[PDB]
Every structure is written in C-alpha cells, then in structure tokens.
C-alpha cells in the first residue's frame, strides 16, 4: 500500500465496513411497504423494528422484533422504500 485513495474507497470496501466506520457514517437500515392482510394502507415498517407492528385497520402481527432486523410474520409482501 502506502498510497491509496482515502476520499474514493471502493463500494465493496465501504459495504464491508462498519456503518460508523465508513467515510461518512450512515444507517444500513431501511423502511418497507408491507401489505397488510386488510386494505386502505400499505404499512411502513422499519427493518430493525423493535415494535410488534400491526396493521392500521386490523390486528395481524406484521413484524416480530429480533436482535437485529425484524421478522415479517411469514405471510406478507414487502417493498423497499
């Protein structure tokens, strides 16, 4: 080494790095549109949700909290915002 572009690290290296150790820190989490079994809204769910998110107009469990990323109740459709 002894010479490298610290201002332009490769995307692979940045993705390997810890979220706080990238050139500019940023979250690796995201938000999802999850199709509730009811209707009238697609619920927005945090990927690393700590809450047992339910439908706005129903009572089905939409995600289950885990150590990291939340689960998704095994029946759901989800898009990444």
């Amino acid at each position: 080494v002894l010479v490298q572009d610290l201002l332009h690290p490769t995307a692979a290296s940045e993705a390997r790095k810890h979220k706080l150790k990238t050139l500019v820190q940023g979250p690796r989490s995201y938000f999802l549109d999850v199709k509730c079994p009811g209707c009238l809204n697609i619920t927005t769910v945090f990927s690393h949700a700590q809450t047992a998110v339910t439908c706005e107009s129903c009572s089905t469990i939409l995600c289950t909290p885990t150590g990291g990323k939340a689960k998704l109740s095994e029946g759901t459709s989800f898009r990444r915002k």
Binding site: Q25, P27, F31, A49, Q50, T51, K81
Partner: protein
Amino acid sequence: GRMHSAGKGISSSAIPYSRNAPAWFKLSSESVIEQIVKYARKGLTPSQIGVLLRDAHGVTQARVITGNKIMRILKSNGLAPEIPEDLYYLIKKAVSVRKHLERNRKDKDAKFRLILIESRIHRLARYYRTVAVLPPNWKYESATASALVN
C-alpha cells in the same frame, strides 16, 4: 466509554447525512406532531414515541420531519414531565434495586450496583440543576424516590 464499567461498546444509531425528509414520506409535519401529541397524552415518553413513530410509521426522525425534537414538541404542547425521562428511569432503577436490597440484605453486588446507579443519578441531577431543568434545591432522596416515580 462506559462511565461505570470497563466496557468499550460503540453500538449506537448512525443517523443519515440527509437532513431532509425521505422522498417516500408524504405525511404532513402537523400530522406527525398530532401523532406525537396523541402518544404523549397516552403517556409515552419521547424515546418510545420516536420508537413507535419510526417502527409503525414512516417518520425516520421527528427532528428532520417536524423540525423539532420530540421532547421540545411535548414541552411546547404542555406535556413535559416533572423530571426528565432519563433521570426518571435512573431513579426507577435505583428504587427497584433498593427494594431488592432491603429484601435479603446480603446482595453485596446489588449494594455496589446501587452505589453506581445513584452516582449516575446525582451526576445527571447536578447537570439538570445546572441548566435549570430541575429546581436548584432538587435533591434525590432514597426515602422519596419511590413516591416521586409513582
């Protein structure tokens, strides 16, 4: 790190560079403030309000969306607690430890942990009195801590 331990954990939230609302967010700022106020009236602290907001809704940061912090919004709406939330939870932990201690009286580790917790309480209370969030004569007393947390 770890004021009262040898741990060097660095785990924390890495908030984004973008200070603006995400492009997929369409709820109004007034609507987010209404949701915040509704949760506060239900009795949620700012931390759990923000947790609910980002989990079950799309509000990534109430500060980037409404332009104000959750606790600031609560104070503006007249829902600020008597003592700040972190101090309240520290005192609640101290109360629980003290109850467990007066039971069975031989948990020397619990005694040590109580010393640590009340040291944290006193440092936080000193800061709050300095910034005049607490009254200048505010004092944490173990005899009154239970009655002040409930």
